[PDB]
Amino acid sequence: DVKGRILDAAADAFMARGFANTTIDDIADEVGATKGLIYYHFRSKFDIFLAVYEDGMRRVRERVEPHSTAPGTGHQRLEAMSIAHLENLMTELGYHHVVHQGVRHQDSTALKVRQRDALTALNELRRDYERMFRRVIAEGIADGSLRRVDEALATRTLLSNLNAVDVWYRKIEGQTGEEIRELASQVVDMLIGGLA
Amino acid sequence: DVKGRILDAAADAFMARGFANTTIDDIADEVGATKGLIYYHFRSKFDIFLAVYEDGMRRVRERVEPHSTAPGTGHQRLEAMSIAHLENLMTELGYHHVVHQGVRHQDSTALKVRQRDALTALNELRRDYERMFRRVIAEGIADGSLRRVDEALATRTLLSNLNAVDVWYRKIEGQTGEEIRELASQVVDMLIGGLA
Ligand SMILES: N[C@]1(CO)CO[B-]2(OC[C@@H](O)CO2)OC1
Ligand SMILES: N[C@]1(CO)CO[B-]2(OC[C@@H](O)CO2)OC1
């Protein structure tokens, strides 16, 4: 799991300073290993950045997908998926920030062409994740557990809203897992159940 | 309204290229006036950026505040305010992007100290706007038109969600005002009424 520890540290370093100003030294500092070991596993700073994005998307899919196939109505499955999405965002916040840095710099003139192409290619992971939510929203409309709404718009809205927790959420030293689930549950109650 | 036209164009230019790579020439191109006229009204690119942020916040407050004091329950007023917020976002999208660029670069090491201080000072406009929504959410809980929830968390969530329309929304050449209100209304129905 040396590679995984490097990615964990890189996620936090990129979140702190952004891709441009983050350096390998910053990451070697965060992970507490040498530049030599980092370069054994990775070719460049940008290679680490892409790997963080990919791993972040892997981790959230692996956490959320089981809830999409468990027994439940569309509403029940959507609620469980959404709570899992937010628990992942809150507990793997650096990975979340790096995914969205990647999306933002997908067209950065500061990058080489191959680098923009690599970030654009990762959009497919995000699109496939969104398809999973859109299917469940469609199913919840069909089983009557969700209000009849535009499936695509509901999907884009829900995912934008879940991710928008990143506007105000920050990690807290002593915050417990049970407490992160409570907070995630409070937000999802508002997103799915509404304010009215 | 020469000054207003410059701000309109600057908002669109900053939205297109960001603060760093936007230039006065870009703005003079967008507005279709000379650099001389722009410098008559403004001292620098950063001065224009601050003015766009301020004007964006002025415009949204002036549109939304009347709905906060019209007759209605907390739910009714919150719905009207939220629709107005989204109509403003969709119709004044460049101003919205500049406000959030300002918030993001509030701590940019690329800026002089005075520039970060000026952007931090503008946070007060955003805080005062949020207070108006938090009051109405509290009132809707008190009049029973909204579900009992944490007022602060509901406020941060709702505003984050309304703004998160910017993830997917783009201006469309022939999009009508009546159609923008319809789309805004569809989103707000989901935000306030929920998906369930
Ligand atoms: N929060 C994520 C992991 O950190 C990153 O952003 B997102 O947004 C919706 C996309 O469909 C998948 O990518 O959800 C997972
Ligand atoms: N969309 C705005 C105007 O463009 C910009 O962002 B915001 O977010 C919530 C803040 O309380 C006020 O600032 O709402 C208004």
Residue numbers in the entry:
A (entry chain A), B (entry chain A): 10 to 205
What sentences appear in the manuscript?
The mycobacterial repressor, DarR, a TetR family regulator (TFR), was the first transcription regulator shown to bind c-di-AMP. Recently, DarR, a 201 residue, TFR regulator of a putative MDR transporter, Ms5347, in Mycobacteria was discovered and represents the focus of this work.
The M. baixiangningiae DarR structure was solved by selenomethionine single wavelength anomalous diffraction (SAD) and refined to final Rwork/Rfree values of 18.5%/20.2% to 1.6 Å. By contrast, electron density with an unusual spirocyclic-like structure was found in the ligand-binding pocket of the M. baixiangningiae DarR structure near residues 108-138. The borate complex ligand possesses a partial negative charge, which is stabilized by an interaction with DarR residue Arg135. By contrast, the HTH distance observed in the M. baixiangningiae DarR is significantly larger, 50 Å, indicative of an induced state. First, the shift of residues in the loop towards the dimer interface leads to a pendulum-like movement of the DNA binding domain as a unit, which leads to the large increase in the distance between DNA binding domains. Second, the structural changes in residues 117-122 prevent the formation of the cross contacts between the central subunits of the dimers in the DNA bound state, which we demonstrated is essential for the dimer-of-dimer binding mechanism.
